Amino acid sequence: GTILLDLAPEDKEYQSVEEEMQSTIREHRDGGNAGGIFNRYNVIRIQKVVNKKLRERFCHRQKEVSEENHNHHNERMLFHGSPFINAIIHKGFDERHMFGAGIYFAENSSKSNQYVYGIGGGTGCPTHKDRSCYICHRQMLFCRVTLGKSFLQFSTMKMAHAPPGHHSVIGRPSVNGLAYAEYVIYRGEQAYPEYLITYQIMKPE
Ligand SMILES: [Zn+2]
């Protein structure tokens, strides 16, 4: 099944992942209700997710998307937060579980952090029922996402699948619209859970 390889903090690969995670934190419109109040994360560990079958499924779909998009799969590295992280690293993303019934990714780690415990932070951490828990270790993924031909929009366009000839939907920010970008796929084989990040949000002074 799945192997989790720990990255060393002194390794450039670990530093690249942590840097992308910390530098993409932003202030949210809810003032921190969903994901908590913090300026920085405390990274516990970063693991690379290895699974032969998941990799086959992802590479097979990447080839189809490339053929349908002028020989360009159009991959982006993006964050994902959800209460299904354990099922994802063993079974892969599954669409069966704003732009409708898709799988959502963000370029801002703090946006994904808002979904780690569910919609609007759900009921918070399982132990303390705290959306802003500074104690419990959280996890998010930093994924390879096959976007192919993306359908860009500034406002809600609810769909069950990407529009004809397209492979993903992108919600772009605008004043009066979305605060931050979101990337949506409608097939789980269009994302690979490359990195598993275990962390805490830090309580500011
Ligand atoms: Zn907790």
Author numbering: 1105 to 1201, 1207 to 1314
Tell me, in the authors' exact words, what the paper reports:
Poly(ADP-ribosyl) polymerases (PARPs) are a subgroup of four enzymes (PARP1, PARP2, PARP5a, and PARP5b; PARP5a and PARP5b are also known as tankyrase1 [TNKS1] and tankyrase2 [TNKS2], respectively) that continue the reaction (PARylation) to generate long chains of linear and branched poly-ADP-ribose (PAR) on target proteins. PARP1 is involved in repairing single-stranded DNA breaks making its inhibition an attractive strategy in oncology especially in those cancers that have defects in additional repair pathways. Thus, TNKS activity promotes Wnt/β-catenin pathway, and TNKSs are potential drug targets for the treatment of cancers driven by Wnt/β-catenin pathway, most notably colorectal cancers. We determined crystal structures of the catalytic domain of PARP1 and the ART domain of TNKS1 in the absence and the presence of the ligands.
Perhaps consistent with this logic, ligand recognition induces a rotamer change in the Phe1188 side chain of TNKS1. The TNKS1 D-loop on the other hand is shorter, relatively flexible, and shows multiple conformations of its glycine-rich region (residues 1201–1211). Glu1199 and Arg1200 at the base of the D-loop are involved in ion pair interactions with charged sidechains of the dimeric partner. The net outcome is a smaller and more restrictive ligand-binding site in TNKS1 relative to that in PARP1.
